[PDB]
Design an enzyme around this catalytic site. Structure first.
Site, short mmCIF file in Angstrom:
data_model
loop_
_atom_site.label_atom_id
_atom_site.label_comp_id
_atom_site.label_asym_id
_atom_site.label_seq_id
_atom_site.Cartn_x
_atom_site.Cartn_y
_atom_site.Cartn_z
N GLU A 18 0.78 -1.24 0.00
CA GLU A 18 0.00 0.00 0.00
C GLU A 18 0.82 1.31 0.00
O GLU A 18 1.04 1.86 -1.08
CB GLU A 18 -1.09 -0.01 1.10
N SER A 30 -35.88 -45.05 33.86
CA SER A 30 -35.24 -45.59 35.06
C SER A 30 -34.25 -44.64 35.76
O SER A 30 -33.74 -44.96 36.83
CB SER A 30 -34.65 -46.97 34.77
C1 LIG Z 1 -36.44 -48.13 33.23
O1 LIG Z 1 -36.22 -47.43 32.23
C2 LIG Z 1 -36.93 -49.41 33.25
N1 LIG Z 1 -37.63 -49.52 32.03
C3 LIG Z 1 -38.78 -50.30 31.79
O2 LIG Z 1 -39.32 -50.94 32.68
C4 LIG Z 1 -39.27 -50.24 30.35
N2 LIG Z 1 -40.67 -50.09 30.28
C5 LIG Z 1 -38.80 -51.46 29.55
C6 LIG Z 1 -38.17 -51.29 28.37
C7 LIG Z 1 -37.70 -52.47 27.56
C8 LIG Z 1 -37.90 -53.73 28.00
C9 LIG Z 1 -38.59 -53.95 29.32
C10 LIG Z 1 -39.02 -52.89 30.03
C11 LIG Z 1 -35.96 -50.42 32.78
N3 LIG Z 1 -34.57 -50.21 33.17
C12 LIG Z 1 -33.87 -50.65 32.01
C13 LIG Z 1 -32.46 -50.17 31.92
O3 LIG Z 1 -31.67 -50.54 32.78
O4 LIG Z 1 -32.08 -49.42 31.02
C14 LIG Z 1 -34.48 -51.59 31.10
C15 LIG Z 1 -33.52 -52.29 30.16
C16 LIG Z 1 -35.57 -52.47 31.50
S1 LIG Z 1 -36.21 -52.19 33.14
#
Ligand SMILES: *C(=O)[C@@H](NC(=O)[C@H](N)c1ccccc1)[C@H]1NC(C(=O)O)=C(C)CS1
Ligand SMILES: C=C(C/C=C(/C)CCC=C(C)C)CCC(C)(C)/C=C/CC/C(C)=C\CO[C@H](COP(=O)(O)O[C@H]1O[C@H](C(N)=O)[C@@](C)(O)[C@H](OC(N)=O)[C@H]1O[C@@H]1O[C@H](CO[C@@H]2O[C@H](CO)[C@@H](O)[C@H](O)[C@H]2O)[C@@H](O[C@@H]2O[C@H](C)[C@@H](O[C@@H]3O[C@H](C(=O)NC4=C(O)C=CC4=O)[C@H](O)[C@H](O)[C@H]3O)[C@H](O)[C@H]2NC(C)=O)[C@H](O)[C@H]1NC(C)=O)C(=O)O
Ligand SMILES: C=C(C/C=C(/C)CCC=C(C)C)CCC(C)(C)/C=C/CC/C(C)=C\CO[C@H](COP(=O)(O)O[C@H]1O[C@H](C(N)=O)[C@@](C)(O)[C@H](OC(N)=O)[C@H]1O[C@@H]1O[C@H](CO[C@@H]2O[C@H](CO)[C@@H](O)[C@H](O)[C@H]2O)[C@@H](O[C@@H]2O[C@H](C)[C@@H](O[C@@H]3O[C@H](C(=O)NC4=C(O)C=CC4=O)[C@H](O)[C@H](O)[C@H]3O)[C@H](O)[C@H]2NC(C)=O)[C@H](O)[C@H]1NC(C)=O)C(=O)O
Ligand SMILES: *C(=O)[C@@H](NC(=O)[C@H](N)c1ccccc1)[C@H]1NC(C(=O)O)=C(C)CS1
Lengths: 697, 697
Positions: free
Chosen positions: A167, A408
């Protein structure tokens, strides 16, 4: 002659126009020149002797703070790597505590910990060594012109000469004409203004004003102006730290930034860069001994650099409104210091970018999404925020806006409410695991089932195992015995929004819709040892004149007892070691992570709450259309956390037991034994002779 | 100081701009200032002692030439009326013969003739006295700006002072600024140009250029500029002849001609006129002793003055193209002197304007129209042209564009062809009046009938009576005996277009479609005494420097013998005295008009050809849609001619018999008698002893 006489008054009328211009130049320059946008910085890390950080962890921390690895140091913002040490030149930074300059230090390591930080000038140890924070972004100015003011010294001598050669040669009275062209006007008028500008303001001020005004780039509807902001925008280092090839490109773009933009057309931009290099060599400064070395370096982060960290910046903006109101914003040259962690973020972004398409192909899906929140265990400081599987370009932040059923993750609250009463509920407390049928106001029967739809052979389970295995049936029974208002009281103390709590038996199993940030608050409260620390993104707000506008302070509040939090945290380690989260504990057993998995009904939402020695991490994996993910809590969400842990160096969780914690032995029947027992459980008791009262039978 | 030094060159740069302007002003002014449009003037009447003109006829001629009647003369273009004389001040006019000034003369009359024209200065008689011609119109300039250049003297001293008082006091160096504003520009630039203009050109030239530039009115898409053309446009007299009230109105319109236009808004125009009168009285020139006399005169011909004489101007333009080609028009300041008669025109226009609505109501019609052509008997000069019942505002000129069946106007040609052979056909030649049946190439029988469908008792009529009574049956018989090629030969000699002649037996009765101008040529040829004089509208075309571009000359051609023309003219007097036209001859017996009526089939077209001592007048009355008029030849067309004769002073027709004309006596049998006879007919014979050859039986 009435030629001179009539045209003598023309010199007078133009001179009074000049006195009008001098009055205008002073009104602008002697005060507010520009509306300088707010500078947003990351966390200010303070290094210390005997601090738990490794050599590799330090390289990653340096690289994340815009530091470059070199074989031989010359410029600041550089570092060298040795077998057991790191030598660096900590760049100058105007820290709120105390303004500092260039400091060359050696950081000696002893594997896992930092032994010493010695100044390479006087060979003396430092009590604490400050690492400068990385500039995240700039908050958009309404004017639409983005800058970063830097004084005269801030610009190196090489760059001034690089600019002088292309410049002007200042010694008269075009440099001052270009200034007034950009600073005031839409040819004769600018040359007249330059005569005033040069006469009143010294040379140094002219090049200081010019080097902060000049147009160098564009991002959406914001003008990237001046050499200091352009340096970080095009490369990623301050103007002081530029190499001559980078200076030449920045200097070359001055006469036409749009056509010399390396993002659009690299060929024309590289050609113009060599043009600046071939102009400098003709002069006494450079010789062809290195022209072919500078012209050989082709340039750049190749990204748009439009909206840096949109997920984390939402919270920064929201908290700036909550603490400072509407202005703030009127003020110019504002420095915002955030809790943002560049190491935690890159690792969380990498875990989102890589993990999601890997889970999409693996499970054969088409629209899987994620959200990650990283907070400080004790202080509650938000270290990292991920709004989706595409965190670079984001419009929807799933960490603050996606309200989902927690599943859970609602289980620890019930056990924390039970373990708050040491006279009644302990880890060895037998909970009934038999069929449930709870009539509600419908009157329909609510029969919650365990995930496998099975019940314990003996018709019971201990408290510890019920949370470890995330058993639904014993959770309800325990939650109904304490009563829902007691469990709702724990949640309020944990820090979750009051209007989201619906005290119905379903709440004990996950009938609580929260955002990952709200989940981060609940888990932080228990991870700190029962101290609810409100989650923050702001450490301080500093004005241009170094005036502290906002300064955050420790405001932690005692929510749940220390011993109840520890017993829950210890059980959360059992879920990661032997329970639902056992897949993580086998990969990292020496981290002793405290955690909890989450799987809502019909695999709609997958959750994981991971606690290390330093941070609480909430990871959510689900679909925006509330559709099945074909994923569980252990898979998906937790597999994104494992990626986050593998992408960085996590702190191992060593739980320090607080007051009245006694490791007691229990028999197969679950009764406290004086000496021995097949199981050792921590107990909140000041006199372990709880065994005597039990053993007497 | 580099203030004066840098701005000393500003005086230099503006002075060289002034030398550029001086060069531009000279390029325009020293040569062509404007494209001055062509001036179109009427006939130049030369008065003479012993000339046949009355006192009343002279007043009408003076009034038609823009002369005003006063009780006491002061200004030129004025006249006074006495019991047997007229005193006038003949205005100055640049005549092509010799340029003349103001001449005050007395015109002494002896009833029907002009006795003397004496100069009132020296009391001496004039051999001939020139009357100046009236300005008809201006031929539109392509620039669209109409002017009439007048020198410094041409503007009176009162008008200069009337202008000085409202605008400037010249003695410096706004008058010269206004000049350059209109003459060159679209404020600082005009004042700079005025400094040059005033310094180089003298005061006299400035006001000469200004008084010919200034905007004063509008007509369609033509700018009426300068005081000389505005004077005639607004009042009807040259700028020299204006009264002070008229000067004040013209002077007042300078600053805004559109809002001070008396045609649109008279109230604001009269108010501004009194404003000029109230400005002049304040100064040493006028006192309130006559302010209330000038302010009491309210002003104007109230017409648009857009297209003056559109019918006559078509021929002027057509002949300018035939004689001078395409330029002409490049030349500036052209003076066109026409054959136009202001007395004959006003009378023909009045006969059209009054006669037609009077014939429309009388006959209960809705769209009756007319056409009138007045030509000089001998020279063939076109004196007047009427294109319709609305001659003021015209688009269609029925005198040059309306081709119509001539009817019985075709009868004189046959008799002129018969009377061309004195050895065979005379006025006493017996023509058969019995039924006709002429087979044509169809083969359909053509049986022409007489208007009353009757035939003569004896089965015959004399030649003289057959034309007098406009008898069809004897016309055909005579025309078929001479043969159609002989009758077609007469027409070519009369001057009618050759392509319009269809030699079929029907031609003898009016199967000849001509325009009134083409009819005017045929009747002029016979009225002059057999000399075909091509009809003209141009007398001369003069350039600005007095250079004669075109000068017309007598180009009459001998077509038919003198004696045959006289015998036809004498029979044409019998039609006006006793025949079809006898209604005219009873109103004006002392005029001895030679004429012929015309009535086409189903009263579609009505025609009349009137010949006085000085002019040939062709009058046509019919409808544009070729529909019945419920009118005849004697009524309608001839009643429009009677109105034309009553509106002016017609010259009585005194037929001078040429060589070999002998008034001979015939008996009841139609045979020439030595002495006596019941009828006296003129005969083309050099030895009347044609009676001896006849009487011997
Ligand atoms: C908590 O999230 C608790 N969930 C359930 O009870 C759901 N309704 C569920 C989902 C798939 C199969 C059976 C039940 C569950 N805690 C968890 C976890 O530790 O992540 C699952 C895998 C089943 S019990
Ligand atoms: O005459 P000028 O055009 O006024 O000045 C130019 O030419 C001078 C000369 N007489 O030789 C000069 C070369 O000395 C100038 O260089 C200087 N002043 O030292 C040169 O000025 C430069 O002109 C550039 C634009 O002119 C371009 O010049 C090319 C060749 O000379 C031509 O081919 C181009 O046609 C012509 O456009 C200035 O850059 C402009 O700076 C503006 C701020 C940019 O506008 C933005 O562009 C954005 C965008 O990228 N899109 C957005 O649209 C945004 O809304 C918009 O505000 C704009 O996009 C950007 N254009 C270019 C080609 O770089 C650029 O900001 C400006 N530099 C300075 C220090 O003021
Ligand atoms: O500032 P200017 O407007 O440039 O000058 C006017 O004001 C002066 C002043 N500073 O006081 C001035 C009063 O000294 C001017 O009088 C002068 N020059 O001595 C006065 O200029 C005059 O301005 C007239 C128009 O301005 C009118 O002024 C009124 C009050 O001052 C306003 O109310 C009017 O709004 C404003 O228009 C000049 O007249 C114009 O002259 C034009 C040639 C006319 O244009 C024609 O008009 C025709 C038409 O009638 N329609 C056609 O449209 C035709 O196409 C078109 O070419 C045009 O119609 C015609 N308008 C009027 C009101 O008279 C008229 O030609 C012009 N006179 C001369 C000698 O140059
Ligand atoms: C000439 O125009 C000749 N006209 C006729 O013969 C037509 N066809 C005619 C029109 C009305 C009534 C009878 C015949 C006529 N000459 C004149 C005349 O002098 O104007 C008329 C009136 C009838 S004979």
């Amino acid at each position: 002659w009435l030629l001179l006489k009539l045209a003598i008054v023309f010199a007078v009328l133009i001179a009074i126009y000049g006195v009008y211009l001098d009055q205008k130049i002073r009104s602008r320059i002697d005060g507010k020149v520009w509306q300088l946008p707010a500078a947003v910085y990351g966390r200010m890390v303070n290094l210390e002797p005997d601090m738990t950080i490794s050599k590799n962890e330090m390289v990653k921390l340096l690289e994340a703070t815009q530091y470059r690895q070199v074989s031989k140091m010359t410029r600041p913002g550089e570092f060298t790597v040795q077998a057991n040490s790191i030598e660096m030149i900590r760049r100058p930074f105007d820290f709120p505590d105390s303004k500092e300059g260039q400091v060359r230090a050696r950081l000696t390591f002893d594997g896992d910990h930092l032994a010493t930080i010695v100044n390479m000038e006087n060979n003396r140890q430092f009590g604490f060594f400050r690492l400068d924070p990385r500039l995240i972004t700039m908050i958009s100015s309404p004017n639409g012109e983005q800058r970063l003011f830097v004084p005269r010294s801030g610009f190196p001598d090489l760059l001034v000469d690089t600019l002088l050669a292309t410049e002007d040669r200042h010694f008269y009275e075009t440099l001052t004409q270009q200034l007034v062209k950009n600073l005031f006007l839409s040819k004769a008028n600018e040359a007249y203004m330059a005569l005033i500008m040069d006469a009143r303001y010294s040379k140094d001020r002219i090049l200081e004003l010019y080097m902060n005004e000049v147009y160098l780039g564009q991002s959406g509807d914001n003008e990237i102006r001046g050499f200091p902001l352009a340096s970080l925008y095009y490369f990623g280092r301050p103007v002081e730290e530029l190499s001559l090839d980078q200076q030449a490109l920045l200097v070359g773009m001055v006469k036409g930034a749009s056509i010399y933009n390396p993002w659009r057309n690299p060929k024309l931009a590289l050609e113009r860069r060599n043009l600046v290099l071939r102009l400098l060599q003709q002069q006494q400064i450079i010789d062809q001994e290195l022209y072919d070395m500078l012209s050989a370096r082709p340039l750049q982060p190749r990204g748009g650099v439009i909206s840096p960290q949109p997920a984390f910046m939402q919270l920064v903006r929201q908290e700036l409104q909550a603490k400072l109101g509407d202005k703030v914003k009127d003020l110019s040259g504002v420095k915002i210091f955030t809790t943002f962690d560049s190491v935690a973020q890159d690792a969380a972004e990498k875990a989102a970018v890589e993990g999601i398409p890997a889970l999409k192909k693996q499970r054969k899906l088409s629209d899987l999404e994620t959200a990650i929140v990283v907070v400080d265990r004790f202080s509650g400081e938000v270290r990292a925020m991920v709004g989706g599987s595409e965190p670079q370009f984001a419009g929807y932040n799933r960490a603050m806006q996606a309200r989902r059923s927690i599943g859970s993750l609602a289980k620890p609250a019930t056990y924390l409410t039970a373990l708050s009463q040491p006279k009644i509920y302990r880890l060895n407390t037998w909970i009934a695991d038999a069929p449930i049928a709870l009539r509600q106001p419908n009157g329909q029967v609510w029969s919650p089932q365990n995930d496998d739809r099975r019940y314990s052979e003996s018709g019971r389970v201990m408290l510890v195992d019920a949370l470890t295995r995330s058993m639904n049936v014993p959770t309800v029974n325990l939650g109904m015995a304490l009563g829902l208002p007691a469990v709702t009281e724990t949640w309020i103390k944990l820090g979750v929004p009051k209007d989201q709590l619906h005290p119905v038996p379903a709440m004990l199993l996950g009938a609580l819709n929260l955002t990952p940030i709200e989940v981060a608050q609940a888990f932080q409260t228990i991870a700190s040892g029962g101290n609810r620390a409100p989650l923050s993104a702001l450490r301080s707000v500093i004005a241009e004149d170094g005036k502290v506008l906002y300064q955050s302070f420790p405001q932690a509040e005692r929510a749940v007892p220390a011993q109840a939090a520890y017993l829950t945290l210890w059980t959360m380690q059992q879920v990661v070691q032997r329970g639902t989260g056992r897949q993580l504990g086998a990969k990292y057993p020496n981290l002793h992570l405290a955690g909890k998995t989450g799987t809502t009904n019909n695999n709609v939402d997958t959750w994981f709450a991971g606690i290390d020695g330093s941070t609480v991490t909430i990871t959510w994996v689900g679909r925006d259309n509330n559709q099945p993910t074909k994923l569980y809590g252990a898979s998906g969400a937790m597999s994104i956390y494992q990626r986050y842990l593998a992408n960085q160096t996590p702190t191992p969780l060593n739980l320090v037991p607080p007051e009245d914690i006694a490791d007691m032995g229990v028999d197969y029947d679950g009764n406290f034994v004086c000496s021995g027992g097949m199981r050792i459980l921590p107990v909140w008791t000041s006199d372990p002779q709880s065994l005597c009262q039990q053993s007497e039978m």
